[PDB]
Paper text:
For the SiNRAT-Nb1 complex, we have prepared samples for cryo-EM. Since data recorded in the detergent DDM did not permit a 3D reconstruction at high resolution, we have reconstituted the complex into amphipols and collected a large dataset, which ultimately yielded a cryo-EM density map at 3.66 Å. Due to the challenges associated with the amphipol reconstitution process, the sample used for imaging did not contain transported ions. The nanobody binds to an extended interface located at the extracellular side. These interactions involve contacts of all three CDRs of the nanobody, which bridge the core domain of SiNRAT consisting of α-helices 1–10 with α-helices 11–12 located at its periphery, thereby contacting the loops α1–2, α5–6, α7–8 and residues on α11 and burying 1682 Å2 of the combined molecular surface. We thus assume that the SiNRAT structure represents an intermediate between both endpoints of a transporter, functioning by an alternate access mechanism, that is closer to an inward-facing state. In its conformation, the binding site is sealed to both sides of the membrane by a thin gate composed of a single layer of residues (i.e. Asp 66, Asp 140, Thr 241, Tyr 243, and Thr 346) toward the inside and a thick gate (encompassing several layers of residues and spanning about 15 Å) toward the outside. In contrast, the equivalent region in SiNRAT contains an elongated, approximately cylindrical pocket of predominant polar character that is about 10 Å long and 4–5 Å wide and that encloses a three times larger volume than in DraNRAMP. Instead, we find the acidic side chain of Asp 140 located on α3 to line the cavity, close to the predicted ion binding site, at a position that contains a threonine (Thr 130) in DraNRAMP. This acidic side chain, which is conserved in NRATs, would increase the negative charge density of the region by offering favorable coulombic interactions that stabilize the additional positive charge of Al3+.
The transport of transition metal ions by members of the SLC11/NRAMP family constitutes a ubiquitous mechanism for the uptake of Fe2+ and Mn2+ across all kingdoms of life. Despite the strong conservation of the family, two of its branches have evolved a distinct substrate preference with one mediating Mg2+ uptake in prokaryotes and another the transport of Al3+ into plant cells. To clarify the mechanism by which NRATs transport trivalent cations, we have here studied the function and structure of a transporter from Setaria italica (termed SiNRAT). We show that this protein broadly transports divalent transition metal ions by a mechanism that is not coupled to protons.
Residue numbers in the entry:
A (entry chain B): 1 to 120
B (entry chain A): 54 to 255, 269 to 504
Write the structure that this text describes.
Amino acid sequence: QWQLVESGGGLVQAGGSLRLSCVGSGRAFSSGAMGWFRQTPGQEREFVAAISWSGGSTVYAESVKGRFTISMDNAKNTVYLRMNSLQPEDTAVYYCAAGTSTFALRRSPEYWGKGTPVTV
Amino acid sequence: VGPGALVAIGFLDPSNLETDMQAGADFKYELLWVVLVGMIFALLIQTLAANLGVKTGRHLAELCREEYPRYVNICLWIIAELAVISDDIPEVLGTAFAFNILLKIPVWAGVILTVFSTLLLLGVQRFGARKLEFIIAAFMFTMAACFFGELSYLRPSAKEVVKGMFVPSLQGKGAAANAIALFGAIITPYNLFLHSALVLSRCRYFLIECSLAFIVAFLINVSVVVVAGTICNADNLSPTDSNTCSDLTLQSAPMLLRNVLGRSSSVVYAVALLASGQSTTISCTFAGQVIMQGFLDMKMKNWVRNLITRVIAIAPSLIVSIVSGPSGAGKLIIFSSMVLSFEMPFALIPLLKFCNSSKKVGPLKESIYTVVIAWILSFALIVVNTYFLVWTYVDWLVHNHLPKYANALVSIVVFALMAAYLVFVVYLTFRRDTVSTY
Ligand SMILES: CCCCCCCCCCCC(=O)OC[C@H](COP(=O)(O)OCC[N+](C)(C)C)OC(=O)CCCCCCCCCCC
């Protein structure tokens, strides 16, 4: 079947270092961009990170930069986001998303994900 | 007093606008280098073509027919006809979009009106000769002024622009698709068949003028890419702006110039698009006539050839517009540019081979450095095309195809077609077909 499945996060205290893995199957996502988005309890979805197939394209959100390291394993077709130096403001539900390029995914992600709650 | 050129007009087709808007809206200033390389390629090849004429007095078509057998020449003519049709699909779609923006009629109405108005445009072209030149110069000036003002208002990051323009990176399959589309829309292989003809009539200053025209065209193209990239991406956008940037057809461009035109950009942009499309059709009519009169010597009236090309182009463009709206037309423009890039090698390899071959070109020979650079670029283009094709097909096959009974048949058909394409390129490349001379 075709789907994207975020996995990880759970709950941490601070400097969580949480290492979220998004696994996508059935549509070959690991050819454009595979990024993330976040949404607080009451709010609109926001950009968190992105990465292209080439490997170096990560465009981050000005709210959080230099704390999230995003890596992509093309062969397994997976996107890993490492959060370090976590803070209460980052509590939110995180949604994996896949697009056609690391900038188009910035605006309209073609494919979404159920998401997981990350609480500090 | 302006010594303008028609090459920039051919570089400012609606296909170029659509490919540039897509590259800017999908990769910010990432594919700018393709505009820099492509133009540098597109100029260089043109020079060779022109030089060929000066050294031979015959178009590339005549030499291609003479030095090749019946079946190779027929396949080359089919490739050239497909190239001309693929070029002429964007003109029809560009004019249809202009009519939709102006008269607020559906896209299919635009395509039908363009089919009706091709004859009127041909008659006007016949009547006036300098009026067309002034019209193209004024359109180029309007595009330059509008986009340069928009760029000045935007104020992008120069460091990022340079890093994106001088550091090639096809970061993603979508980037490969848009890079190939840009190469197709800028190289425009069929123009070779036309350009040689321009020297059949009978140069440091001529080269300088050509380079100035190309620098203006390249500046306009870079400005379009940068403006689309900065405005569509920016840092924070309204939901309406994001939704418009997601698809970004040729009729949502007015959103680009809103800063420097103030809600009056619709009419000016529609007029610019219509003028560019019509002028590109006027230029490509001569190329179609030269292809037909060189590959098979079957003399055809310019108006008849133009009508046939416009009808063959409207068939698919009209079908796409009926089935799918402006987004479908944008996809069709990108696909036509991709096909142009894909079949460029067949109309480029004979040119380089004849330039090298002393038999056909005679004692005069082109600079070895330029020929080697053109050969390397052409090989790189072929490799990128094949890599993108294998990439897309493999990704479609691995998980995007449900049925298995027809999977083997589809795979065999695709492999056979790709093998035929590569075998033809190899025949034309690592093989000498020289049974003639000056
Ligand atoms: C010369 C040898 C050619 C032989 C044919 C081999 C290639 C077959 C590829 C299968 C396409 C496919 O399966 O579709 C895959 C992609 C999908 O694109 P999308 O935008 O995401 O739309 C789908 C949107 N989804 C994701 C929501 C469903 O299609 C393309 O991107 C366009 C492919 C253009 C390839 C160039 C065609 C020109 C070839 C002829 C040149 C002379």
